[PDB]
Design a protein around this ligand. Sequence first.
Ligand SMILES: OC[C@@H](O)[C@H](O)[C@@H](O)CO
Ligand SMILES: OC[C@@H](O)[C@H](O)[C@@H](O)CO
Ligand SMILES: OC[C@@H](O)[C@H](O)[C@@H](O)CO
Ligand SMILES: OC[C@@H](O)[C@H](O)[C@@H](O)CO
Ligand SMILES: [Al+3]
Ligand SMILES: [Al+3]
Ligand SMILES: [Al+3]
Ligand SMILES: [Al+3]
Ligand SMILES: [Mg+2]
Ligand SMILES: [Mg+2]
Ligand SMILES: [Mg+2]
Ligand SMILES: [Mg+2]
Lengths: 393, 393, 393, 393
Amino acid sequence: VQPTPADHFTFGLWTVGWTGADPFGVATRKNLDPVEAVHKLAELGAYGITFHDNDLIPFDATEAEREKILGDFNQALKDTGLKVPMVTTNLFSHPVFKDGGFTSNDRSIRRFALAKVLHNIDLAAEMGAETFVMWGGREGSEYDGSKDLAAALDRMREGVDTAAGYIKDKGYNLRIALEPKPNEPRGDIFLPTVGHGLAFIEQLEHGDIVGLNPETGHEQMAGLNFTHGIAQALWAEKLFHIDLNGQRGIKYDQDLVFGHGDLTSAFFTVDLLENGFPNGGPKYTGPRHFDYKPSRTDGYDGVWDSAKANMSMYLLLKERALAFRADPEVQEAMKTSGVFELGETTLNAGESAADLMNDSASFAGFDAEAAAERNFAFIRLNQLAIEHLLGSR
Amino acid sequence: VQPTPADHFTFGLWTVGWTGADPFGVATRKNLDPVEAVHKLAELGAYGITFHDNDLIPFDATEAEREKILGDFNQALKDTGLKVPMVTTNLFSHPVFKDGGFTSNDRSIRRFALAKVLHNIDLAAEMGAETFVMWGGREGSEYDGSKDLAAALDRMREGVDTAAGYIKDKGYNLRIALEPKPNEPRGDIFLPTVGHGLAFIEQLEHGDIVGLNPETGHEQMAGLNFTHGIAQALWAEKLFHIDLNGQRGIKYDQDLVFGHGDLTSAFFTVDLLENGFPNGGPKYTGPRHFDYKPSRTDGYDGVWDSAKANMSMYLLLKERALAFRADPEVQEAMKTSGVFELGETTLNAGESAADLMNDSASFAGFDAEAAAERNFAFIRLNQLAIEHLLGSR
Amino acid sequence: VQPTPADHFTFGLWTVGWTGADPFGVATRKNLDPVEAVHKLAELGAYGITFHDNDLIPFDATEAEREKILGDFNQALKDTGLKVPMVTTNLFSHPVFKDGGFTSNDRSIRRFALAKVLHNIDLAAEMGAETFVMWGGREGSEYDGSKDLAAALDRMREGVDTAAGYIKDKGYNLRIALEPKPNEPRGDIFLPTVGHGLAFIEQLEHGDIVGLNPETGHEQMAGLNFTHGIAQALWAEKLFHIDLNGQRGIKYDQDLVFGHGDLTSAFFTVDLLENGFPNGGPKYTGPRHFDYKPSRTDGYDGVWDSAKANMSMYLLLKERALAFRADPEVQEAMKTSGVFELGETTLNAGESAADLMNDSASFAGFDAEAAAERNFAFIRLNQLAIEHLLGSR
Amino acid sequence: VQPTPADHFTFGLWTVGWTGADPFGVATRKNLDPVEAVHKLAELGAYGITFHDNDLIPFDATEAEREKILGDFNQALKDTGLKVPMVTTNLFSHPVFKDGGFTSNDRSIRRFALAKVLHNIDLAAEMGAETFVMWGGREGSEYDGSKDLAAALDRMREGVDTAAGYIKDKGYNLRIALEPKPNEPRGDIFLPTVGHGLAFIEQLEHGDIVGLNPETGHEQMAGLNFTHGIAQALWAEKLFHIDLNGQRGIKYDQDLVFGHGDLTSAFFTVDLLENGFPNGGPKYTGPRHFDYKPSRTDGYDGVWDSAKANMSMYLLLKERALAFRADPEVQEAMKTSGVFELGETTLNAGESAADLMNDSASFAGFDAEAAAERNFAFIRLNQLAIEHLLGSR
Ligand SMILES: OC[C@@H](O)[C@H](O)[C@@H](O)CO
Ligand SMILES: OC[C@@H](O)[C@H](O)[C@@H](O)CO
Ligand SMILES: OC[C@@H](O)[C@H](O)[C@@H](O)CO
Ligand SMILES: OC[C@@H](O)[C@H](O)[C@@H](O)CO
Ligand SMILES: [Al+3]
Ligand SMILES: [Al+3]
Ligand SMILES: [Al+3]
Ligand SMILES: [Al+3]
Ligand SMILES: [Mg+2]
Ligand SMILES: [Mg+2]
Ligand SMILES: [Mg+2]
Ligand SMILES: [Mg+2]
């Protein structure tokens, strides 16, 4: 399996650039020059690179430094051919963002945070990004009385709608993608799961350009089924981007290589990205972005190995998932279990509520105990899927 | 603390009627006559009673039996004065519902399930209920390939929209309330959290009459903040009902008495139900419904004790939550922490995106390190809240 | 991969005999006759069968019924050659055990539970079982004040030492194995994980014959690593038996087929059971016992499919794990990462604490900054295992 | 409730000295000088202070610097009278310990880690500490194939027995206390819960002087009951020290103030530390050590508030717990529920297993159906505890 730019594997600069500092220890790796990252990633088969404004341009950078850095970075882009599909803002590392950007209790700070996002939309626009991500990491609380929960959601809408309004105003071909996370760094984060982000979008003035950027590990941190979560995002036509990684349970976000967490879940995420829905439906057509961190135990060969591991993992799962649905045994098993039958509407063409209550065959004369005898054979369909995952079929 | 009908404590018949059978053991209590439950609950201060169609009327009941039971039950209602604010359908106990009602793979079963709900809307209407609850307990899967996830959501919409359409058609003064649950009985349940239920409502043809019925324990089973979840439901004006109980962690749904789980969370749920939001906003005005199960270890004195425990727990939390916000120290502490400041809009009246990026005080000349010095004092606000919870203030 | 008696695959009578009643519904399958169970299991390639006293003999059975059941049951064993390697007692389904068997607050229930176990040891010995499992499913509480926690453990010790002493006194060739479970059906069970189980055994008078019976799903309910957990039992020489199944997450116990839960974990469990430790050490030679339940959505064809699936899953993982370890590229990745270097003692033969203290090279002149550059290459080593698991190397 | 030295409240230097760097941002507070820390703590009513060798003496410090630091530090102790009851080692922050101290795959890191601990025992003894804590924070893995699991435990044993033997050899008056942690910073830590810690100690050569140092937040990260967990350590005579804090859920460790997590659990922890067991047994007489971190959102006023808050929380719970147990209504609720009857031996003085077996009244003529009607009244008993906790009885 060799990734080619046609695969669309994108990586953030913070992923391979993550230095190894965590709650209990200092960095184990030297900083990564952004030019170097770009060249390395392009030699592995990456299609593009993403960044946070401060991944690239330091918080205190003078104008001269910003031009230099950008000059250096765009040169690397021109040399390698890498695209920049997504840009995001860091509204979490500086101490001023300790209570949030957009939902900070301090108003002067809320205003700076929205100003910092607006400037970053310009930059995103200049880099040719199609997506602008919002990961509200400091938006939330440790204690329940710290916030007025209705005012926090108004404050979040004000920021997102101002951003969206500004895109429309400038004529930028950019969409906003919110990235849910249930906790960490805060005790509780606002809009914690794919359903909470989708719900919020519907309350926005400019929600037509706002969608989601679900991350595997984030949903699994609430113990939810990531595949089910991206299926709801897809079904509402709001899956604008994805952050792929692995997580091994309900605990801190591990950010492991994609497929290095819940493998069977990973397998069915790739089937959904590649195969779409069994009865037809929208398909995810964007970048397959990896948002992970190379373990701090490993030196720089480990970093390039882990970059590679991501794309290898995606490609192997993809091979198996295509083999899985192409198998006649699997198709027959899907039929038997009623996967295709789920696709047929419950009512008949022009059959109303009254029409059906009335129909004696569907209710009064319906034989509930006979119907209950159906062997759905979901275990056998599950064994078939795993056997294809293990490469034994 | 003595509950009076003015408190609006409602209980389902399945709660005190729960007999004690679980995964590993048989019932420890005799069945509860519904007439008796009604009389008992009315003597404790209950305001109303709720039920599932089969809690009352057996699945195989002949018409004569249904009239008898209903005659017996409405007589008890007339004698005690209890109201019936909510009615719900059992789409989970019979073996025919093993794969779901509305999202069953078998179409004949999907049709029976919708027929069973439609008939139950009539009954709900006849009992004078204001709310009709939908808890999709068997809608989901154990294995990821069992369902076409986009067709499961279409199938769920077909059922809910047909139900809603039928209410509108009959002129019934009833609203539908969906009740999210992340797992149990299925491995994964569709619409698993408050955000997922709210997201789905926005895709419905008749979503103006569809809202939520969040349950405490259900949200805590995903490890989410229940108070934050009902604040988002309130903020979207979709908190139509509530199921109160307690849960002690991420594990099976325990269904303990309300306040017998996460006490501090319970405390802040009551503050939100009673006090509303600190800066103003919608208020929950419905029944305070308890959906719990008396421990199987206890005999029938324990059952009435636990019914009582629920209302006692609510009333004690309520007393403390009113004392909490009335305290001048607490009001000052809320000010200092910026609880009130969160309520002020981020932008100035008629200030646009361009206007703010431009303003040098908000960005370019904003002093980020000085701003970061603010002591938000959230710990001290948290200690103040707990001290009022413990009755030491 | 076709299993054969030589594989030592054993199944409980309650696994395939599980009829589908969960907490939200009734049985979806007809009762399985135990003689049919023996015939079907033997035909599939099983080596043995295990049971709970009330899995075979009803609670209410008379001595005539008991003798009748055992004679047919023993004839079936004969006809097929299945052994009965483990026997266990039901100390959880009847309403008398609602507060527990050995740790019930009621003393008369405690003597009844212990007498029920004492008679059951006699049946275990008669059947030729080598292991007597003890799963204390109702030993625990929902509320912290329900029990005197020191007393609960004194009473647990008393039951186990009385039973252990009875084995010793009659010279039966049997060992006791405790099976930890963190929760369900109690909110908290005593001896919740493998560590608590092992710790508890060291306080026993007759600890020499008491060991553990870990269950995959049970340690995963606390989010613990099952391979780490069994490694510690193995290391202590206390892994006497095992219960294999699957669990997707921290939630109720699912009891899926082994392999249908956390697959990467299942792969390494199989590497530890089959291959042991990289540097040598203890090995688990017992039966490979499946403690799972066929999903309630499926008819009896799915029950036999599921039994089959457990054995296939085990043999497919076994194969990948043998090929994984045999791979020269893997053995070289292991040597880079220091897997074999962990096997070396830290101290030199004859070195003492003082010796090492005052060895300048190990401390005072140690280059800590040079030692930290070591690329452990744990990521690469993990990718090699998944590629072997995926049937790609 | 004002704390006083007699309360035996100790705080680590790293708790109040924690500056705010988390995984998504930098320090939000200035470094706290250790002499200031002693002065501030003593003034608040603390009895003692604990520290990690690098909390006081930098990793790079020269012998001149080390002696300079200790002389000022020892003068402050003198001036104030604070004791130093526990000393611990940092075997987790420097990049050399990225794979662990005692269980690092690299042998040279293993001798360095053990030498660092050996020198630290000498400092502990000089300071007059009675306890030497060992938190093995980097002993573990992210991937299952990274370690030989039996070797990891042999190496852990080797370090602890070498250190234990050194204490014994120099006649220091010190005990070792292991502090279990399930995850973070490793995906899986060896000896993840109290049970694994206790089990491991029984395999030690010098186990007599090795015990535990449980931490509230740490057992709650596996969803375990902290009161059950410490009860087992207490019952084993292995609770040598404790780390108190709060955690809201299975997620990263929050280290909130004690009481700001699971409050009902905190109440019963305090009842076990203060009051012991209802029927009598062992008691924990050590210091009440707070292992927490002041939230990064707050300035130094919140740091002193938080230190204060830990002590108040403990004294408020203590009070409620003394009044709870002293209550005649509670003592009568306890007697109904069988709390005192669990204290009776199941077997009669001199009864043997055979005796009970053949006692018709305890088995053969036992009315199991009559015994099951017993109302244990666990719900009512729980309501009495919450009402005492709520300051209402
Ligand atoms: O949990 C961290 C999130 O994964 C973010 O890194 C977003 O991907 C970008 O801000
Ligand atoms: O988890 C079970 C749910 O709580 C349901 O009982 C609804 O409340 C009613 O169907
Ligand atoms: O959770 C249930 C346990 O797995 C038990 O079935 C034991 O294996 C046998 O009693
Ligand atoms: O998770 C961190 C632990 O609580 C440690 O701080 C120990 O208490 C001391 O090393
Ligand atoms: Al991301
Ligand atoms: Al409910
Ligand atoms: Al088992
Ligand atoms: Al600690
Ligand atoms: Mg992340
Ligand atoms: Mg429920
Ligand atoms: Mg089990
Ligand atoms: Mg900690």
